[PDB]
Copies of this chain bind each other. A is one copy, B any other.
Amino acid sequence: MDIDPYKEFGATVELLSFLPSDFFPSVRDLLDTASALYREALESPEHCSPHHTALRQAILAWGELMTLATWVGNNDLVVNYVNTNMGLKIRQLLWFHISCLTFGRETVLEYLVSFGVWIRTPPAYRPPNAPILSTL
């Protein structure tokens, strides 16, 4: 079985691999961002949005990955191995769902094709400041 996690939300894995690899903030910055303004919404008993159902499983599954790393740390390249390949897939899943909740789903998707083509023009022919999605 092959299923993209972003497929119902209107994006792809390729369109999330369209941004650079080190554009996404770290997991500590992203988890504190969700814990900043989405604690009373994520820990609600009733689900509000399909982003909320996907984000409850993104945090819990990364919790299972971290306690697997501390267990294998006791019994440290393997704790560094998870942040290379398994760590990119959780940052992209966290950044996409946090930003779609704050700003909007279609606003993130239009930003992904805007920052993707901004990073792939020559510097002397593009707007100099990098595009950042923001409120107002």
Binding site for B on A (CB under 8 A): 1-5, 7-10, 12, 14-15, 17-18, 20, 22-25, 29-37, 39-40, 42-48, 50, 52-54, 56-61, 64-65, 67-68, 71-72, 75, 77-78, 81-82, 86, 89, 99, 102, 110-111, 113-122, 124-136
Q: Are B89 and A113 in contact (CB under 8 A)?
A: no
14 contacts between A and B (CB under 8 A): A3-B60, A7-B45, A14-B32, A32-B120, A36-B113, A54-B54, A67-B86, A78-B78, A114-B134, A117-B133, A125-B130, A127-B130, A127-B134, A131-B134
Q: Are A3 and B134 in contact (CB under 8 A)?
A: no
In the bound complex, residues from chain B placing their C-beta under 8 Å from that of A42 are: 1, 3
